[PDB]
Amino acid sequence: SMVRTEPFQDGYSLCPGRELGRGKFAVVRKCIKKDSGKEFAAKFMRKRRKGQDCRMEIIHEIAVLELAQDNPWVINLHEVYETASEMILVLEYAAGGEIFDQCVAFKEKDVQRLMRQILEGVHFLHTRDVVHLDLKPQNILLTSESPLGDIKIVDFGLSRILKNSEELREIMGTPEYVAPEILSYDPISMATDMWSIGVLTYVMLTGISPFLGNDKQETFLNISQMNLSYSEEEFDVLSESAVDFIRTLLVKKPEDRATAEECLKHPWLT
Ligand SMILES: CC(C)(C)NC(=O)c1ccc2cc1OCCOCCNc1ccn3ncc-2c3n1
Known part of the structure; x- marks a missing residue:
């Protein structure tokens, strides 16, 4: 500037x-x-x-x-x-x-409209090699409360520009020397952003933070090991596509998560 x-x-x-x-x-x-x-x-x-x-x-x-x-x-x-x-x-x-x-909570119709907006901005950042790392409600602004307006993402203080195939090639180095705890590591990537979008979708449709545990090691333990069931009362009035959409994001293995691009083509938003 x-x-x-x-x-x-x-x-x-x-x-x-x-x-x-x-x-x-x-x-x-x-x-x-x-x-x-x-x-x-x-x-x-x-x-x-x-x-x-x-x-x-x-x-x-x-x-x-x-x-x-x-x-x-x-x-x-x-x-x-x-x-x-x-x-x-x-x-x-x-x-x-x-x-x-x-x-x-929000009507499923309103979250559909809002999430398509969120995902288009996220998708735009990700094609710029920017990962946000702080997608949560405190950073999602609505241009109108009543009626529901449009989303604006407002803070980028935890955001990074990320490297391409260099991530898992030049950084890792010669494969015969790599230690086994490296092979097991998952680094911060664009899929980290999509987890957060899957958490926010969940929160938006049900009013429940899915991994919120009793303490913080419970919260951290739920994130690492809890396989969600989507069997709560709050899901009876929700569409099958809404649950499949979340199942596509809250995958623990980063590589298996849906990208923003694939989200935008998921039947739930189309
Ligand atoms: C990351 C940080 C908390 C410092 N936040 C920001 O960087 C920010 C930037 C712009 C606006 C709001 C922001 O923080 C959210 C607090 O806002 C509460 C709701 N009030 C309204 C109403 C209209 N607007 N128009 C712009 C912003 C805004 N906030």
């Missing part, structure tokens, strides 16, 4: 009242562009994290946001500002929008 050094508050007024949202290292405040009147969402991101300069982390997010600028299901970046301590990303504001988590 072009990075502006003139004071942010000369072009924008900050809206009064509570912030939109607050991640670690970032605060989102609704604002108004003075000579315009238009609403935007201003993402204040500290450049320092645990004493270290992390400007490059903000630069990475801008780069992803820009890669995705013609993706209609990713939030638009309008402008970037820089102070000594902060960087400010001025992002588009969904007038009347909402985080999908505060909107709460």
Whole structure:
């Protein structure tokens, strides 16, 4: 991006009242562009994290946001500002929008429409070699609560650009020397994103987090070993294709998971 050094508050007024949202290292405040009147969402991101300069982390997010600028299901970046301590990303504001988590279950018809949107944005990122790694409701924005509007994906702080066939060739090295715990490893890939989409689909249709256990080692144990049954009362009014769609994503072996492309052709969404 072009990075502006003139004071942010000369072009924008900050809206009064509570912030939109607050991640670690970032605060989102609704604002108004003075000579315009238009609403935007201003993402204040500290450049320092645990004493270290992390400007490059903000630069990475801008780069992803820009890669995705013609993706209609990713939030638009309008402008970037820089102070000594902060960087400010001025992002588009969904007038009347909402985080999908505060909107709460959904009708199967509404999840079908919404998941096709999510999967098209994810599919677009994945063809750009970007894996999101944080697809969850806190990061899925609805342009309208009532009626249900369109999804925008809004944060990319855990996102990565991934390598191709080099992953399992030049990295692994000469096969006769590889240790057996490497052969058994599954690295973070585009299928990691699809697991999360399978978890969100489940949550969206039933109101149940499928692997939520009693403690955290239960939650972690359910993720590793629980074979879901889809036999809950909440599934009686759900279509067979909806359950097959989830079964296609919540596969433990990453290589067996459906890709976003195949999801978009699954009979459930077509
Ligand atoms: C990752 C982080 C939590 C810092 N979040 C973001 O990077 C973000 C970016 C833009 C908007 C909201 C964001 O965080 C979700 C909190 O939002 C609660 C709902 N309020 C509305 C209503 C309309 N809009 N329009 C844009 C955004 C927005 N949020």
